[PDB]
Write a protein that binds this DNA or RNA. Structure first.
Length: 67
DNA sequence: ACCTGACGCGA
DNA sequence: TCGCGTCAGG
DNA sequence: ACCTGACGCGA
DNA sequence: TCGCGTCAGG
């Protein structure tokens, strides 16, 4: 499974993503359109259940500024 | 949150 | 190839 | 104030 | 997709 530190980063990114999405008044569906991914994938990261892959980490910082 | 098709990697 | 875990959209 | 169709998000 | 909570007009 994931390393204890991997879990931590999961929670970190997701919490940051959610907070930046509320400031941009975005829905998960809308943010997923921006991030070029599924709305379910948004909730997955947003709940620290899965670390973003390489393609999405690049987009997360591009769209939200979180890296 | 759970069901399922598909990719990543080997007590 | 065979087999579970995981990644992804629905 | 309550009934109901529809959107937001996952102990 | 499935399922409750909530948002909205009636």
């Amino acid at each position: 499974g994931m390393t204890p530190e991997e879990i931590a980063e999961a929670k970190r990114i997701g919490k940051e993503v959610k907070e930046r999405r509320k400031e941009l008044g975005l829905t998960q569906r809308e943010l997923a359109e921006k991030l070029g991914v599924s709305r379910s994938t948004v909730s997955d990261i947003e709940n620290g259940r899965r670390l973003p892959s390489e393609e999405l980490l690049k987009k997360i910082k591009e769209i939200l500024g979180v890296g």
